[PDB]
Amino acid sequence: MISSLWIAKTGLDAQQTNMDVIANNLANVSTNGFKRQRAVFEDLLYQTIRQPGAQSSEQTTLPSGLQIGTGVRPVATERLHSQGNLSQTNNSKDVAIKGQGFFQVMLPDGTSAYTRDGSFQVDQNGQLVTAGGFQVQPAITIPANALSITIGRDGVVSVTQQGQAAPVQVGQLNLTTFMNDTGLESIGENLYIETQSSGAPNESTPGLNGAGLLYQGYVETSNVNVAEELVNMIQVQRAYEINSKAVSTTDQMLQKLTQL
Amino acid sequence: MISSLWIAKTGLDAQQTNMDVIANNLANVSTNGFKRQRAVFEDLLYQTIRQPGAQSSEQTTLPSGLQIGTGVRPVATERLHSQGNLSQTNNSKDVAIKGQGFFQVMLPDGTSAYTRDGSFQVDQNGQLVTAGGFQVQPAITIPANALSITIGRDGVVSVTQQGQAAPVQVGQLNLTTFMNDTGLESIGENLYIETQSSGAPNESTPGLNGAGLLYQGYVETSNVNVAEELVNMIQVQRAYEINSKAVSTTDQMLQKLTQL
Amino acid sequence: GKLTNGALEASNVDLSKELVNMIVAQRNYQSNAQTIKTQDQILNTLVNL
Amino acid sequence: VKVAGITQDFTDGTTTNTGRGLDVAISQNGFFRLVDSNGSVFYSRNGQFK
Numbered sequence: 001m002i003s004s005l006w007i008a009k010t011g012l013d014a015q016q017t018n019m020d021v022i023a024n025n026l027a028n029v030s031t032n033g034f035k036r037q038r039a040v041f042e043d044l045l046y047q048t049i050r051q052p053g054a055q056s057s058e059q060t061t062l063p064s065g066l067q068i069g070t071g072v073r074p075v076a077t078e079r080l081h082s083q084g085n086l087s088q089t090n091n092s093k094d095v096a097i098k099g100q101g102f103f104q105v106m107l108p109d110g111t112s113a114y115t116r117d118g119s120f121q122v123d124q125n126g127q128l129v130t131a132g133g134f135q136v137q138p139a140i141t142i143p144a145n146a147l148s149i150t151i152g153r154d155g156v157v158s159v160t161q162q163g164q165a166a167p168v169q170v171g172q173l174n175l176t177t178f179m180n181d182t183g184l185e186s187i188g189e190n191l192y193i194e195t196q197s198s199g200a201p202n203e204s205t206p207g208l209n210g211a212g213l214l215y216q217g218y219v220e221t222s223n224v225n226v227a228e229e230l231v232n233m234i235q236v237q238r239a240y241e242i243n244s245k246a247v248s249t250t251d252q253m254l255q256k257l258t259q260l
Numbered sequence: 261m262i263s264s265l266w267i268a269k270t271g272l273d274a275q276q277t278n279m280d281v282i283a284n285n286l287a288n289v290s291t292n293g294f295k296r297q298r299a300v301f302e303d304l305l306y307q308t309i310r311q312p313g314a315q316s317s318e319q320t321t322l323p324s325g326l327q328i329g330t331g332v333r334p335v336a337t338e339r340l341h342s343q344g345n346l347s348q349t350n351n352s353k354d355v356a357i358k359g360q361g362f363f364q365v366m367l368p369d370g371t372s373a374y375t376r377d378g379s380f381q382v383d384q385n386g387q388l389v390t391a392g393g394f395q396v397q398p399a400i401t402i403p404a405n406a407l408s409i410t411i412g413r414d415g416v417v418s419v420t421q422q423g424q425a426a427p428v429q430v431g432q433l434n435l436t437t438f439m440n441d442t443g444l445e446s447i448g449e450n451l452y453i454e455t456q457s458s459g460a461p462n463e464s465t466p467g468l469n470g471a472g473l474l475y476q477g478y479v480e481t482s483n484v485n486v487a488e489e490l491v492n493m494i495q496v497q498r499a500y501e502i503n504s505k506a507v508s509t510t511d512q513m514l515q516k517l518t519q520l
Numbered sequence: 521g522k523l524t525n526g527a528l529e530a531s532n533v534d535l536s537k538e539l540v541n542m543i544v545a546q547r548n549y550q551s552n553a554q555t556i557k558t559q560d561q562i563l564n565t566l567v568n569l
Numbered sequence: 570v571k572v573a574g575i576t577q578d579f580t581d582g583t584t585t586n587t588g589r590g591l592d593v594a595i596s597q598n599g600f601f602r603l604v605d606s607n608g609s610v611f612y613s614r615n616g617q618f619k
Contacts, residue, residue: 012566016562019558019559019562022555023555023559026551026552026555027552027570028570029548029551030545030548030570031570090580091578091580121576131573131574132573147597147598188571189571189573226547226548226551229551229555230551230554233554233555233558236558237558237561237562240562240565241562241565244565244566244569247569248569251569413606414606467605467606467607468607491556494556494560498560498563498564498567501564501567502567505567521595521596521597521598521599522596522597523593523594523595524584524593524594524595524596525590525592525593526586526587526588526589526590526592527584527585527586527587527592527593527594528584528585528587528592528594528615528616528617529581529582529583529584529594529595529614529615529616530582530583530584530585531582531583532578532580532581532582532583
């Protein structure tokens with residue numbers, strides 16, 4: 001109903017968004033292949049009133065006119081794509097990426113999502129699947145009579161059968177890379193789908209023109225840093241409290257006026 | 261006396277009911293075979309004003325009319341019938357349930373009640389009774405000169421006598437299962453009675469059909485998770501304060517009305 | 521696999537890894553409790569307006 | 570966050586001599602097959618038999 005109230009009602013909402021981002025980052029501190037978020041803000045409208053640079057006289061200009069501004073709005077929350085620390089949890093079905101590539105996974109509806117999570121399982125039919133049961137691509141089947149699974153640095157999946165001194169190649173794991181990794185649309189379950197801001201999916205082999213390397217027995221942990229999130233909570237809490245104090249001051253000002 | 265005041269009054273009552281549910285869950289942490297309660301709410305009636313979808317002109321309909329709603333009401337309190345942690349008390353008379361069955365006891369009224377509590381005693385008559393003295397159908401009499409009681413996983417109760425190389429079976433503990441477990445009416449003293457929404461009591465041996473198994477020397481602790489209750493208490497307190505603030509705002513508006 | 525007679529297969533739980541995981545899990549739980557406490561001190565501040 | 574699942578590290582553990590003839594250890598893959606009193610089929614790696 002008054003200008004300062006709207007401005008401080010935008011400040012509250014922006015700080016609440018910042019707290020939401022911080023809390024979501026802290027909640028997923030242990031999920032493998034996670035990329036933490038960062039919210040960015042920008043200034044709202046700026047009411048012109050007296051125009052800055054307006055010609056007051058015929059020879060004197062008015063410097064920096066009465067530019068009363070509106071509150072703040074957040075542009076977006078961008079994913080900080082950095083390499084999480086690798087952990088040696090020593091299982092043949094866990095693979096970790098060393099560069100900037102993504103695994104391709106086929107969704108049940110026929111479309112393809114992209115995930116950096118390397119915790120793979122084997123279904124009842126012998127196909128490699130994501131822990132959520134989504135089958136990986138371009139399909140790597142694993143026989144029932146398998147003794148050991150070896151996934152090399154180039155993505156070649158080999159299976160050694162019983163009593164045979166030579167391994168059997170059962171597929172080739174490829175990595176998808178994008179022009180813009182941030183523009184991908186996250187659909188949950190550690191899955192990202194392609195968006196027009198992410199360019200087009202460029203499939204590549206692990207070690208060539210820019211796909212990362214795969215390490216077997218390793219899991220890529222999250223890049224969330226706990227101490228920085230703690231400090232950011234302390235600063236967001238203070239900013240939210242101060243903006244609420246601005247709301248309260250506006251409320252008190254409106255009280256006296258009405259009482260008059 | 262004004263609509264918003266009634267809505268806020270209903271909200272306060274619902275939050276108070278939630279707090280009572282939380283307090284009841286907290287008070288029964290040490291009870292054996294206790295299933296925690298959870299309250300479910302529904303939104304109340306709607307004052308129609310303009311009907312949503314009413315034909316305004318001859319061809320254009322009115323989308324999403326003025327549906328001013330009333331407060332909230334709690335529908336139900338549902339138990340979480342989940343297997344609690346088993347605790348070893350190393351007692352020959354304490355029994356614990358592994359599945360989803362119930363013990364059948366006889367109230368002195370003459371009707372049958374159902375309890376999941378397994379801390380059993382023997383009365384001066386030698387029968388098996390519950391700690392509240394209710395006699396445990398379909399009825400197990402323990403002889404005078406007993407040396408040890410062995411209750412098997414399938415419910416066979418045996419007593420080893422002095423001078424007899426073989427155990428003597430003195431009964432068979434049975435379990436009753438319901439098609440709807442949450443529909444039972446709790447009468448207190450760890451007893452549930454059958455209603456018409458709780459289906460019909462299906463008696464079976466522990467192992468056959470779907471009834472669970474009996475473990476001797478174990479007691480079933482309550483399934484109450486405490487940290488969840490503390491977080492729920494914080495949420496309930498804050499929501500109650502918010503509803504109280506709404507009541508205060510309505511009171512202030514009414515006060516500024518009166519003087520006019 | 522082949523059967524070995526007279527031997528038992530012991531568990532595969534390494535205690536050191538379990539202890540360090542317990543430590544890190546405790547710290548993560550405390551951090552989540554801290555952000556829970558912050559959201560409230562924010563809700564309480566908004567209420568006290 | 571959502572817990573996707575809970576797995577079990579099916580790697581071969583320690584083999585410890587016991588001196589009894591009725592304990593069997595399964596190196597590499599394999600599961601002992603059991604039937605309960607109901608008739609359901611179960612599988613177990615514990616070779617402590619009696």
